[PDB]
Design a protein around this nucleic acid. Structure first.
Length: 88
DNA sequence: AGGCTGGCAGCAGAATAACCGGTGGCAGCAGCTGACCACAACCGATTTTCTGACC
């Protein structure tokens, strides 16, 4: 309990609370188990009717579940420039 | 009897899974307002300046 609770509290930059981390993990497991059986990526309608929620709610959860990229990686593959100098 | 001098050798660094309880936020909305536009009228002189009669 302590390890999983603290991993939810500290694993992310923009902190997501524990209950939304629970529903993100549940949506991930549901999507993986449906993708294995279908042979295809499941639609938001199929995920929403599986998890007993709305497709808008599924889209909001998949919106919240995104990690930031970094400003310091060299997006020029020659290494001369980094990403933080290409932002207006 | 060891020691501290000497190269000698080796190395760091820089550049090019779920429950339960509780508690506070919050948004939605009837329901006092209460200040506020806001038309819309209505008058209070005001000044001009004819209008009308006076002898």
């Amino acid at each position: 309990q302590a390890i999983t609770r603290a991993m939810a509290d500290q694993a992310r930059t923009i902190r997501i609370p524990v209950h939304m981390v629970e529903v993100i993990n549940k949506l991930g497991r549901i999507q993986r188990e449906l993708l294995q059986d279908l042979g295809r990526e499941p639609t938001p309608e199929e995920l929403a009717k599986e998890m007993d929620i709305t497709p808008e709610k599924v889209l909001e959860i998949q919106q919240y579940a995104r990690e930031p990229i970094s400003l310091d990686q060299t997006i020029g593959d020659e290494g001369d420039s980094q990403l933080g100098d290409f932002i207006e």
